[PDB]
Amino acid sequence: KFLEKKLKKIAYERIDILMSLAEEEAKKGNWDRAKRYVYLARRIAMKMRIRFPKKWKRRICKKCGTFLLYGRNARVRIKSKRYPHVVITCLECGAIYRIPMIREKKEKRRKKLEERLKA
Amino acid sequence: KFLEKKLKKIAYERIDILMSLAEEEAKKGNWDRAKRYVYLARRIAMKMRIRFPKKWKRRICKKCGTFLLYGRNARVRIKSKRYPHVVITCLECGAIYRIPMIREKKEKRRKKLEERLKA
Amino acid sequence: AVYVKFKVPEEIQKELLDAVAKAQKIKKGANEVTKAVERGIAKLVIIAEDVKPEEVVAHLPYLCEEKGIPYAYVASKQDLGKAAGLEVAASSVAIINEGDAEELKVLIEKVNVLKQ
Amino acid sequence: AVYVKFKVPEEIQKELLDAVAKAQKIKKGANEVTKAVERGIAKLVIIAEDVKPEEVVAHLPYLCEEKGIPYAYVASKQDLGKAAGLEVAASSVAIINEGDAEELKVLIEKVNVLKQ
Amino acid sequence: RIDINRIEKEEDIKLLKELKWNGFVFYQYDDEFSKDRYEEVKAIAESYKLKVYSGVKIKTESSKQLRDKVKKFRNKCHIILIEGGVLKINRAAVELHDVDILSTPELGRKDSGIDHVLARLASNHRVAIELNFKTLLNKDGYERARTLLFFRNNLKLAKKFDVPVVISTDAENKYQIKNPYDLRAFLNTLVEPLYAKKIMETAYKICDFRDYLMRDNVVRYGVEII
Amino acid sequence: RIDINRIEKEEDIKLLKELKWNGFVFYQYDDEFSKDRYEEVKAIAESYKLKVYSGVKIKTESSKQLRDKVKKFRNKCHIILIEGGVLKINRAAVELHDVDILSTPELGRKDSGIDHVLARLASNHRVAIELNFKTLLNKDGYERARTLLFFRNNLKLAKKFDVPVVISTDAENKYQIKNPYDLRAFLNTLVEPLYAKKIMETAYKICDFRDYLMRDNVVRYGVEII
Amino acid sequence: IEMLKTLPPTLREKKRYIAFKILYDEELKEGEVVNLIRKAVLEYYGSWGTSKANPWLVYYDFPYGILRCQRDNVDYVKASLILIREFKEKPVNIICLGVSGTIRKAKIKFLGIKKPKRWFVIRRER
Amino acid sequence: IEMLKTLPPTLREKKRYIAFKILYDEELKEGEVVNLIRKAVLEYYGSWGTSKANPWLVYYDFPYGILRCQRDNVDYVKASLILIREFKEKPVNIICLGVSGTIRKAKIKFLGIKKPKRWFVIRRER
Amino acid sequence: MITPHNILRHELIGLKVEIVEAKNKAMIGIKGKVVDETRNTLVIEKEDGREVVIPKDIAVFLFQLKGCKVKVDGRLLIGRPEERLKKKIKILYPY
Amino acid sequence: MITPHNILRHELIGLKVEIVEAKNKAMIGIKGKVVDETRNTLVIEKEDGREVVIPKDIAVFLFQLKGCKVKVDGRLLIGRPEERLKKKIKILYPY
RNA sequence: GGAGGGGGCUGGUGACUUUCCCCUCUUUAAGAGGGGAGGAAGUUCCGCCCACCCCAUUUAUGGGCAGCGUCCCCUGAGAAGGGGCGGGAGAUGCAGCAGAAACGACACGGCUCCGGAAGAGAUGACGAUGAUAGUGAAAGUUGAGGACUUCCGGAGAACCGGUGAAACGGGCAUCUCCCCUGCCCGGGGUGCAAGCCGGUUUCGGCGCUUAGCCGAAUGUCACCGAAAUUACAGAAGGCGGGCUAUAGCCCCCAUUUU
RNA sequence: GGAGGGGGCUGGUGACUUUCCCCUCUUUAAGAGGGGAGGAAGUUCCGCCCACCCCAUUUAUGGGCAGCGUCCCCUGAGAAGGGGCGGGAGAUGCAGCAGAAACGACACGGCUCCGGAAGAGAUGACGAUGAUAGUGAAAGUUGAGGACUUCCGGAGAACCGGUGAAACGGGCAUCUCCCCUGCCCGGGGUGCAAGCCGGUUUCGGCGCUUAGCCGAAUGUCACCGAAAUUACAGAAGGCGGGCUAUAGCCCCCAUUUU
Ligand SMILES: [Zn+2]
Ligand SMILES: [Zn+2]
């Protein structure tokens, strides 16, 4: 248990330094180099069975594996008419992934119901 | 002395069989073969320091070494006018040797003087 | 809590609220500030700190750093909308034309000192 | 003693002396018998045994054997000259024409039996 | 050129330095070792001109309970050396792979020195066989022949499987010390002049590695300076 | 395969024929030999299946007066054998060139077996050196070593100058008889397996030549039949 | 327990079995003939030559006997059998009968005619 | 007279001179040190190995000593010096000093410093 | 943090690495950061910009920590970057 | 007369000689008389008429006496016909 | 030119000794001649000849093998190595957590209709976390004196599910049958330590050998050659195929280098 | 293709050990590097450098070497090996036997003249073993009623001597001078065990070494190569020439053979 937790403290940095090295190389223009780093990061996650950080979770297309720089190779928008969600689409391959916030939208509905009943 | 005399009995035959073998080969026509035998006979005489036989003495020219066959390669004559002597001359080379009998002529002179004085 | 990269002082925090109220030529909304930074007319982007969920303004600091647009944070979402001129709170406000606040927006550009 | 090759009987020895006296066509001398044997007219050559020195008739047996002329010996030199017709002894006598002794000279040719 | 003997006085140690020897090993054949023997042994080394490496000894205890015990005792000394004729002690000594050398497989068992399977476990564990010369000194005629045929069987297994061989006089008194050259000549006598020379190097190559490991901060063949 | 020993009875001669031996030599080590020993020795040879060649012996007399004497005695027997430690007797024995073999150059002189100049006179005279095994049987430890180093000096002179070598047990009683194979194995031990085989042939090649010389009318290696 | 795995035939020793016989009037024991051989090897081979040859006696009931030696050094140990001269009141003279690679050929060539296989039948029974 | 011509240097033996020393408290005689060496050669070399080595002792006055052996077998006889353990009440331990091809280098390298030439001066004088 | 004990479990990518000893004479003396990593081959880009193919087993690397320098053989560094994190223990001996 | 004892002093010229053993395979089996003689070479003319060159040292000759036949090696027959008459003694050994 | 990988070949001649073994011959007992371990003999994953028993005497049924080269997938300095051979139907499994939902589809949440409650007619409710709002409603363009709603429950055509390796829909793996094309027909079970014979527990012979041992033989030296007794390794009824470890030289490829 | 003869080459690299030796260097005494027997070192037939003494200080005289290749002679299977270098004069030797006579020529026997004796004038003496008889008279042609002689002694122009290896005449061998042509000038004697030095009989150092020992070192293994440590053989101041013994391969020649 002690050697498992100390290895998890090591491997938490190994997904952190390899992803931050991928971020500064992706703005250089070498998209094939940044795809190599996260492929090592996606491979080292499943051997230890550890999860990705919440900040670096939405930065990678799940289909191809290119790092998404907002505006450079990524087109992000807020579509909130029907259901509130943000969409990331890779300009290289063309896959589409979305992040709905309906569970956080449900709280402000429930918070405003409690404010109307109290007032 | 005994080994010297027994070797002389041997070597007396060695000059005899080698000369008689030279005589029958000389009438065959091979004069070079008969010259080889007597050259071995003239060589073996001087190592032992033995003399030639009296019969085979006058048969060989002393210059060249060919066997003389009377009439074939030898011209023999009796010249008795001035001094009585017989001459052998080799038809091959041309040397001349003579045998005077003046010491035997002197005896019949001395024998006839004793017959005149007694009668 | 997560997308905030630097701690903003309180004395300069009102100067973000003073610059938006003095100018009143602004774009409100999370989509309109994203269109302003990619075109380059936006000189200053003001982001609230108490947003929930954080994904609606999480791309705002990463887009402002690559485009070269100065930005800073404000702690209140409701006070940003009141200075912008609305009774409803706005998550983010970008400035196009300062007008009288052109002398003020250079003083907000000392946030680059807070970056290093 | 030296040039004699075979021993001649006494009964045939007079028949050599009879053949020379009957014919009386003969050549006397050591030179004339040598000329007769090389020409081949000589049928029989008679050589004395008591010669001294032996070199005057030593070539007579060796020349008669090569030419193929039959020859035999007589013991006396004086009796050879008396049968030849001379008071002085002759060493050797060769026959050319036998005449009445042609029947006798075939009987002298049994000396070839004495040769082997 | 490394020698293993028991120090008594100064004069025999001064004698071995005058002839051929470069550095040798203190051989504590007891369960009672301390710093009192260690402060004297540095005085003999600095006396004329010498360097001494001290080692300890354990003998005839159990298989796996001796392994937990001597691993605590090796942290205070330089090297260790295990002896035993029992095969279950000889087999258990090689699995721990922290021992450097092993001795006496011929005087306790009196059957055969090294087995075939015992040499294969010494390959990946890197345990050397130590040859002794104290044994042949006080035997009889046939008894000298029996240990010598056991030694010839130990040389062919260490040559084929590449097991290191280190010679020792294993001396006790002033005069059992031998020179290295006759010891080289005795190993030249047995098999080869080439294999006799490499034995002296494996005597040397052990004491550099054990010293440099505990000299500085070296862990798993990695040194850290600056 | 030729053996040289002294016959006593029938049983030891019957024993040597059963194992390896083909023909052997009667060794009369006395000055009194006659036909009485010769009529018995043919009865032992025709007893089971054998062939025996009898030889005589002379010892410690003068140099040149012994040569005129033993040349009369050799006309009645087959072979002769001369022994002596004195070098003036050893030198005088080889010049007569009618002796076949010579023995004991190490027990009389006790200095060295064969000299360098002694081997060169044995070349054109064709005298062989005979090696003995009776000597090493009754020596001591160092005494066995001294005759063996003398024998190694005699082998190198006979190999370079091509001197024939014939081995003998030189036995006296029933049990000093050895087999030829250990005698071949003892000569294979000293120098070579090739030179050990040729020694047995020179043991054989002597007794054919000495027999065939006096078998028929053979004089100076020339035989006359018909 | 004392159990050693037998060496593979590439690594095992090469051996020959020396058949010999001591022919005399007096009797010899098994402990005597193992001692007189061992005294003979130390005098001829030496201490160094003993390990090269590895001499061993297996069995001795008759005046006959079977002795073990190496395959390359049959020639040197056969000269060791003949140089031993006496045993304390009485001579020694070992006459060899032959050598072979196994007990099976050595027991039937010179010693006997039949084959007993005794090592197999006493191990599983006892 | 007993006089033998010396062998030519192509045919002569190749020799080395072993300088050694016996370091002890008790004393040894010349007849003792020639016996303990000869007992050591018969145990190690054997009877066959003795003629191959040709051991010889020339001179012994001090605890030092000079010993003769062959050039090819210096290695085997040096192990013979160390295996001898005791002499009847008292141990033996021979320590070698070095080997050389002649007396002249062996007497000055380890034994002494000067050169005496004693074999030449006692032969012509006596 | 980066320690010499956990340097066998550390990711070599993003660390300045220079080689002091190697069997091949060209690979001695190059300095740079590691970009990619395979089982027995390190990929180091120089400050000049030349990508150089370096096997691990034949050379020794000098790693640059936060200030410190550590000398570790590449014989301890056998393995892919995936399974080296979980459990890889190697034993070396200088003989 | 011709004796086997004096056959080494006898003149070989005029004697029928045949060879039984020789190292060269052609010289075995020829029969004829000896015409000429040198130191180590015999000259034999066949009944066919072919002159054949025969060395003495390599073969053995079978001499034809008056009826008898003698076997003598040519190793005893070394020497010219001149000095062989005076004194020549040779010793041979079959080893 | 240097670490490495793959493929091929691995003996011949002469001498000694029947005391290295077998076989043959003659001969005053011993001699002469010939032959004598491999590419894996190791590993036991196989088949057949050979044997024995059971059912059957059948290409009617049915059983067994193959779909190669090529191509596909994975790993290394990318030469090379390893595995597999098409389709249809049925069943089970993809845990745990996460996700509306985890292998057939669904229920559930956004959309529409009905019922109940709350606020309100130049006001108030809501809305830049997106307002009346459209499109094949994944996605994308839109962006406010815009503006009539918000919540809960029930029923339904169409579209879409923040996770995770992998989803209103197609995959992956295993097992069993029916669809194919070609070839061959006794089908299973054990196995030479099988099986048979004198013997009748045990043993000897056979099965057994152009090496044929069994308490397990096949030895030593020299040399041409360069393929050589060096590495790995040693027959046990034979042959064929696959895997495994490597010496010497030849051929091919790579990297460093120039 | 097989016995044989002659000529040429005969080591290099790597490892171990200063305990195989020498030399050099540094250094917590031991390590590292380099070198280490030949074509004959054997044989002593030579010379010189090097040393010492005597005479001489001379190319005036005189001394020393060479006339090679080529050619001549002898011996072997006739390739090959060995010996010698022109001429003139003088002396000795070619024994023994044989021959008139044996090394300069002669005496002697056949030829001529003189003296003595014997026989004799159509006789007798002699003569086919040669008669009156000739030729530059060695040799060769001659060959009888041919025919006047035969012997001994002495003196002389021309020609020839049965033997023997070799002769009224030319050779051979040795020794000493005078005739030649070219080159070089101290001439002899001994010799490193010479000679010199501390020493003062004896010993250590020098003479001594790109191996330099002296109670006499120069070692072992592997390999390319094929010239290799195999044959013969081992330095002792160095160099040059000649003789002697032979391994391995290359080149040339012969015989047998086809
Ligand atoms: Zn993508
Ligand atoms: Zn003529």
Author numbering:
A (entry chain H), B (entry chain G): 3 to 121
C (entry chain J), D (entry chain I): 2 to 117
E (entry chain D), F (entry chain C): 2 to 227
G (entry chain B), H (entry chain A): 2 to 127
I (entry chain F), J (entry chain E): 1 to 95
From the paper:
RNase P is an ancient ribonucleoprotein (RNP) complex that catalyzes the maturation of the 5′ end of precursor tRNAs (pre-tRNAs). In contrast to bacteria, archaeal and eukaryal nuclear RNase Ps have evolved considerably more complex protein subunits, four to five in archaeal and nine to ten in eukaryal enzymes. To gain insights into the structure and function of archaeal RNase P holoenzyme and its evolutionary relationships with bacterial and eukaryal enzymes, we reconstitute the RNase P holoenzyme from Methanocaldococcus jannaschii (M-type) and determine its cryo-EM structure alone and in complex with a tRNA substrate. By using homologous structure modeling based on the crystal structures of bacterial RPR from Thermotoga maritima, archaeal components from P. horikoshii, and the cryo-EM structures of both yeast and human RNase P complexes, we generated an atomic model of the dimeric MjaRNase P holoenzyme, containing ten protein subunits and two catalytic RPRs.
To reveal the structure of MjaRNase P, the reconstituted MjaRNase P holoenzyme was subjected to cryo-EM analysis using a Falcon III direct camera, resulting in a well-defined electron density map of MjaRNase P at a resolution of 4.6 Å. The EM reconstruction revealed that the MjaRNase P holoenzyme indeed adopts a dimeric conformation. The resolutions of the cryo-EM reconstruction were substantially improved by applying the two-fold symmetry, suggestive of a very rigid dimeric interface in the MjaRNase P complex. The protein components of the MjaRNase P complex are arranged into an elongated configuration, which can be divided into three submodules, one (Pop5-Rpp30)2 heterotetramer at the center and two Rpp29-Rpp21-L7Ae heterotrimer at the ends. These protein submodules are intimately stringed together and serve as a long, extended holder to accommodate the two RPRs through a highly basic surface (~6500 Å2). The (Pop5-Rpp30)2 heterotetramer mediates symmetric interactions with two RPR molecules, which are organized into an extended, twisted Z-shaped configuration. Both termini of this extended RNA architecture associate with the Rpp29-Rpp21-L7Ae heterotrimer. The C-terminal long tail of Rpp30 sticks out of the main body of Rpp30 and folds into a β strand to become the edge of the β barrel of Rpp29, defining the key linkage in the protein decamer. While Pop5 only contacts one RPR in the complex, Rpp30 is involved in electrostatic interactions with both RPR molecules. L7Ae specifically recognizes the K-turn and helps stem P12.1 fold back onto P12.
